[model samples]
Target: ESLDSKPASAITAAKNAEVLKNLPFADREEFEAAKRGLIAPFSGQIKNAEGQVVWDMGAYQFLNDKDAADTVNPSLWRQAQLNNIAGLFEVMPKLYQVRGLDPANMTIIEGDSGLVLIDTLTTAETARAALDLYFQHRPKKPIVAVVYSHSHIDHFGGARGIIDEADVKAGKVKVFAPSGFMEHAVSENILAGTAMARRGQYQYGVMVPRGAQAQVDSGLGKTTATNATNTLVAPNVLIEKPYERHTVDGVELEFQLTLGSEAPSDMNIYLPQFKVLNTADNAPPAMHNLLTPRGAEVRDAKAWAGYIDASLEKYGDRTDVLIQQHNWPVWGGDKVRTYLADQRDMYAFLNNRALNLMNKGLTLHEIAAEVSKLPGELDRKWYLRSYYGALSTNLRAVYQRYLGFYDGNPANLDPFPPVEAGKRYVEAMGGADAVLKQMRAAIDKGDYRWAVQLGNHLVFADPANKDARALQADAMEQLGYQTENALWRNMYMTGAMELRHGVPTYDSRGKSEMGRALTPDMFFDLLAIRLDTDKAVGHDMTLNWVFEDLKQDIALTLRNGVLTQRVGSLNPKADVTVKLTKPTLDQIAARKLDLPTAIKQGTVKLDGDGKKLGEFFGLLDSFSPKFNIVELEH
Candidate 1:
């Protein structure tokens, strides 16, 4: 809990409270309540070498922030702003959510026999402190069941602190999640984790200090906590089917699997006896982000709407309380029904409307501008505001959802990357001075959007151009402030912040313990996914990988430039067998150990032949350890 000796100026600490107190809450009482909540939430502290207190958002944050200036779009900037807003509110009877808990809520649910925790906060320490706070009101009941709402780390990252792994293994405590939960949760984030984390820093405003003009809400939670909190643990019980019912700790609940929605593996549940519905992230009180700021697969808005409609049909009539992962609970059956309807309609309108525009031969950008409104009832609801996800960009996401990146425009079919595009545009415009003139003119006219576009070209063309970079930063900063969505604000401000300050020198995940926890199958599978098809051309090899943890053997083979991997232990030997412990493989994937060097040092054994290993390594194309999302070099 010790913070660095950077003594908070009487001004800085005082300003912190002043800024929070002035932030918009629903009412005066809520504002004061939130002000009180901030005291405990901000208690833990860490100091950087400069002796300033800091919070660590994990490895992904820094990775995401690497090219923050160039990669973050104005649209994503809006989303980050909403994510930074924080407050504490009652989500259900006996359930209180610490909203804006660094871009995710820590939901405290009290069950009959014990507390049924839904999605432990992002780390062990944070979850422990959150639960400890809850115990102040209720008796410290055993955490009987911990329900992972989805696959994302924020949903279940804090498993270790909430309940011991030994307890879950012994079946003393049940950790429930969707089927394919482990595979999707670990793989989706881990495979792209290093890159994703880098991009996430900008998306979540990892480096942006908390300030009004600087960092705002991320539409998900607070700016990621800069604590020693980059650890994770897996869940035990799997929720495979929809409408599955189970009573955990005397709490009767019905689970509905809404797969391929917001997350790769996600679920929503209803407490039948209490008439309380826990939609997890599916129905977070904020406008659901169709596409997150950080790069990932596009979420199907149509499917998202369908699920919301389905939840309505299943639980609408009886549900009196709607508790989500963030924000205040919607009380009364009518209000809950209306809230669900509005959320459903928001997605439906965007999906259908965007598809209509796409059919009319509009590009993704044009479609985003075209699809805008819903009924007034949905529009007026504060819960449905574009705090986390904006309608403007979500329309583009819908266009992406149905038509994909291609808009049937040949001009855009094979567009150059940012740097190349910038270079071409600048050259066509008679170079730097000419481009700057136009951009400066746009900025003077208060056309920040146009300025950002032109400035982007200039920055991409010449990253070291001080004038271009300063103007671009200013354009982004203004956009960040005006945006209502949390994620968008963070993305914008963080981008601007990075444009001024160079990228962090060290990797945040250089010491993450979770990297060692990866299963061998996961490591190999990830490697297979990462294999470059072009490099593997004309190369055919079969390798058998064995894992001692689960006693599983997988046959990994490359055929027709496609990697076909099967899980089985048939003694069909061929090229070479990769004989290594799971921990060693995990270390390799996590970048803790160098694969080639480790093999040379005899840390990992390649049985049968060394040439086979060399051949496989040759076939494996190395990805750039450092990549810039924003202002990328050509």
Candidate 2:
């Protein structure tokens, strides 16, 4: 549960030596020079917990040198370590950054009145540590406001630990976020909560090996904290429209809403007085994901570019300091302007080029293969490299953004699922032994791509094949090591790790609950929405229900298997009328107490026939009460 303080060297050295011994560098001197660069400007802090050493990020070279040596690409391994070499950089007289903190800059802003906190760290402990570092250098001052630049959890998750919520509620402190922030923040994950939460384990390597040989780092930030540290706090002040001006505790702030950009709802704030602009997630220290492979709605590259252009126009000329939610700050005005322009061009190039290819009738996979022009300016900028979200994935994402998921190819329309196709593919490729020989040849030739594709088919055809599974693991390890992109590394490494160690199950204590808190009208509407169309097929069941506490009547029906419920001033008479209190109904809906149990206990009062209540409960399908992600199923 606590952070580990293990040295990266303990895991990396032997692995690096092995890889070097096997694949000797063509240019020894050049490789040695790059090796030095791999560990350049080395600076990091370590904490020991439970007799283990944990690096709060920073240790790329250390990790690459020793552990995870088999899976990661040797070339990328060198670069990742080099990228970890970070230092403190001053952006303005009062603002500083812990540069290269998890490949994202951690900015410290000093307001004239007090510190204007922008984007708290990803975790409470981390944020607390970063703030204490700031306090060490400057006079202690109260935090006047905490500005969540966008809806991302990293931008606001640690808010409570940073500042007191009571102060915010009492108007002593202000919390500002873009309009629709609450909806986007709460609903994005809720609708797909179960799936995302489950898949997130593999994407973030939550249960993977922490050693270099096992798991190293995610491209975005460091590995996610595998703890129950998440909570939601609604924003007190909402910023709407393009340019909204607001002053908090004598600090001038201008908000610009960027709709349908990186996230569904996002905004950037500028401090004109300080010539400091907080671009939020729009402009991180790195080239962002066009589509995060972890899985979410694709971001609009066109929209993304336009907003960056707008930011340049609105705050470009006067801005001297640029602080982003992640990564470091841009100090000089010219450097800041150039950085913005480069990012603007990057997105624009990706969109326009992707669309151009799409116009030529190229499929997403084809376009990804075709596009390789990551401008040297961006490619070499270190931060612009795809450490988290890679250029390759983004290229594919751009195609997805424009042409949608389909490739207009009939063969792909209704293809067989993975297992079925895999079985067929293995059979066609001269059976298991033949496929294994081909894959082994690929491995010898360092054709990892081919090896993975072939070996995967063999394994999927029959996962019990020890040889195929072992080779597949080998291929995946190499891919993870070679990938310069962090998320790509995690994805590949985590997948390989999972192949060895099966999926983890999650089990936790249960809780009793009431239904969603909402007006009666909304509740009824929700019920209507939940009715499955397939289940309601060709059926028209109508009824009227009355509530005594509120003295209201409602009409509901299942048309085409979809329940349509409404409450009104005038109730329409129907097949049956049942009366119940809000609490009793809520308990029934939440399944905390069943309909029959509540009725038998006299908690629920029904005036109409009992048959009507039986019909309602029968029509609804209840979700299973048990599911686990991080533990054994049994």
Candidate 3:
């Protein structure tokens, strides 16, 4: 175990102990509800067609029958233990959920003809495994319909697993999603996918070991489902209106559009026939993230809280079973109503509290500290626990949504990057030796926040300093162990791991499955972002591109070092006209084919000066996902 992390530092242990005092550790209400309607637990491993184990149901078995270690936060340990309760559970007589199989839950609503599914998990393997488990306990049925609760990878990425694309095309199966689902779903990862995927390694602890001293729980779920295939099925049915009604296979459904909440395109499914309210991810076991660390548009917290409140008002009187995509379902109309209201209030409190302080001229960090803990019992409520979402980050997110990154102080208006700041800070603190001494003292004094701040400067200033790396790694690990927010813990631990072992090299798959579905406009948009301005300093050229597979012509103009794209009509004064199918474009993007190779192979037909193709392609900056975050790039 060369990668074995040391025991929790004394400071981390003390903080872990302090968490025991404030929360209601005695309350087993959530635990009982988590295990309420267990049909059967899925054992063994879920493997893909390639035989790689994508998800092991018992991977988190270390949490079983074990108390929280000094290296682990108690609240997170409790959540991890609850996550260990994996199985197909009965949400109601007609509704059932296969939880713990993946980060998101897959609910099967049995209808007269087939099954109506709610939010497929992150991958094909896990979704298939979850469905297989359901068929084992319950009767086998077709997936008559699928409702993507939100536009997220985990929600609809497993579409091809349970049902086929042809089935969706031929009207054998129907797929439903929010209005903006396809656009948001397809584009979220493409434009900034490399950075997001890299940061996601830290968010999900993908590289960290699964143990008490390492990665414990992912606040939202155990971890992201490990599968190579994350296919998406374009929704044939869109819930455009505020309240949309649909019936599939004798199952009556009411959709509550929850836009700008947890996701850009999100909706809550209400089963009028079953009298169950599917909260999507709005009412998760842990507090929801306003902006996930993995990266996305900062969520609308005011809109988020308001959407939950609207759902409460609309369905409180009728809801019998409350099911969320991330956690276990709750039964009883009264408790469901109370849970909805409490969660609604929780989000509103974080939103209003942050904005109130923000208007008072307090900066984001100060505002975060101001509302670190909620008043009274809401702070102790297990559901509101800072597992996935926290007061610290969520409060900052509210500030970011409104005020942005700039804190308005003239000194803070344009701060130096870590590399520049780290150098100055290291020099200001005397030298490396002095900075290390100060960091060590901070660690000893249980001031890890300060230690990490100092550690960042030391490591960035002296990336070659082995001692600095080790000390920074050690400090990060302790902070990782002490955190209640799983994302923060994972980032801390992953950064430490990277600092210790160096950034592990691996190929991260892009959103190629949704490749053909990308609009011509979207392709041009991607081109615009990827264009390296420095490379295009002298270029003032226009290219008319036609995707013969689709009747979409794009006029791409490179002027002022900016790639501006026009749709439909092509510019007569274009330098070159390029003709290719969307699939050809996709293959080049997938790195399977090069532009020149495609031209030679006749996949891409080009007219006018072909040298312009080279210039155009050269100007495009192909992003690498392995860019370092915790340290400076070599």
Candidate 4:
């Protein structure tokens, strides 16, 4: 099929806009809250040091001075418009946040002597620009400390921009983060990170066209800053207790441990000095993902629910304003209580009700079909709406969490993989032409789900068939337009974009300072996964590595196509021995410095069998970020 853009079908056009009638459009105090205490509004595009478009607010200009379009969900449109209110907003007196700069918010609190920063957003370029904007209105004070509310990239990735590493090393500035923050931040992004980044591209609409019928919003923000720099700065202070009270500069902060909640190492900070509770991503404006579309460990629904009250019972009574890392603050007392309770109940209900149904022998999809939305008046609440996380798919995620993928059916136990199953399913449906006819009929009858399933079978069975490809793209596009959830819409629309056009290409080699912070064991494990089994199976060898900067050592052995590692140990009689600083290895990991180049520069030392080191390097696979998603499996 020729590459082309398509409009929303007649069915999608009405279904999307018509749902606006039932929503409580009157609850628009949030719009005022979003624009509250606006000292200055940011109007220009935020560019990188190299003059690249890192963050551009102008892309979302369609959201301004316009109501929800015919192809957009009205409730989501309302939230998108609020997210469109870009600039530095004053939460109360000393508390301020730079919202709509990146996918996450960069919060700044005025300290006794210097400024204290919380959550530096997703990229340094955006983070720096956000700080500069704050300085334009407020005093240009130095940041004395940085607080990481969670381990997620959106919260901690741009840390380096706000504070210099020189300050962190010399004790000039302090970095406070929860315990295990380093491990989660490293492992989450490095191990299988490539696949996660690719899937995140689909979820974030990174490649999809930006318009009403296409990528409208990310539910969190406009989306991640385009091609921006995202780097991680290691933490110096670790909060390990359930609750800890500390004063930064002069701001008295109470940190409640909400680890294993929204993030593996997330914390909620209550500023006793200000009585504002920043939940980070734990309780943002929109309903969060129990399982994000981009891969992540399924977040603890129970703990997530518990942490909401975990902060509420302790500080809720005294709190006046509620600010988070995602959206604007809630100022009034009742609004703060209700918002916290509702968000808590939303997650609790997802977990509790799913268990209630699954105990009655309902399968995954069966529960998804049954529980279409949340119960009570919650479904009517705009914050609990299916925006970042959809009800049906989240229910599916719950099932996957407790029961695993098996659904107590023997027939499904050994089903063939996708490609094989597609071939079988298509053949059983008579033929490719027969599948096409039914798919078209399903689409005409407004059964896009069935049409999508049938279309998937058709294309996977015969990848070269243009008719199947076209129909699949058309059906997925229709589904995208009809969807209410932002991530789901992006995923479906990206699928359609890829099938009709072709896989967009980009360079895989890039810099990620996140790798530099990984522990010796963590980096060693990542190396083990990349060993090409076919090349290394028979050429078994032992290698020792030492990082002089970290004073850590690891020994690796490749045997029977498997690589095993041991930290704090060095193989004495190994075929090859190598020594290098972790920074040198991190550079090689990012491909900014080649392994051979490092070796030649004497940054990496070889003690024995240098040729064996080359052989070992040759056996490790190099991953490409440009792999296909919507096409046949390679």
Q: Please tell me which predicted candidate would have the highest lDDT against the true structure.
A: 3
Q: Write the per-residue lDDT of candidate 1 for residues 360-402, one digit (tens) a residue.
A: 8888888666656555667655567677788887888887777
The CA root-mean-square deviation of candidate 1, after full C-alpha superposition on the true structure, stands at: 7.5
Q: Give a tens-digit lDDT track for model 2, residues 1-634.
A: 1112212232233454565554434433323322221212325553323423223454344553453354454544544554444544455566566544333445656777787767765445445656656666667988888878777655665566677757865778888888888667654443334455556666656566655555666654555544323434567888887789988666778888887777777888787777888887888656788776545778888989999999999889999767765544556688779889888988888888888888888888898888765766565454465666677778788877776777899888887755677789999989999898899888767677888888776766677787776777667766665555667667766666555555545411112111232346655655554556675576566777777787877787767777777676333546566777776776666567876677788676655556766765566643332333222232
Compose the digit string of candidate 4's lDDT tens values, residues 172-228.
899989879988887677787888887888888887777887888888887777667
Residue pairs with backbone atoms closer than 3 Å in model 3 (clashes): none
Query: Which TM-score value belongs to model 3?
Result: 0.95
Candidate 4: which stretches are off by over 4 Å?
A: 1-3, 507-511, 587-602
Candidates ranked by TM-score? 4, 3, 1, 2
lDDT (CA) per prediction: 0.67, 0.64, 0.84, 0.83
For TM-score, the strongest prediction is 4
Which stretch of 10 consecutive residues in model 2 shows the poorest summed lDDT?
Answer: 507-516
On lDDT, the stronger of 1 and 3 is 3
TM-scores for every predicted model = 0.82, 0.75, 0.95, 0.96
What is the Cα root-mean-square deviation between model 4 and the actual structure?
1.8
Query: Number of clashes in every candidate structure?
Result: 50, 44, 0, 0
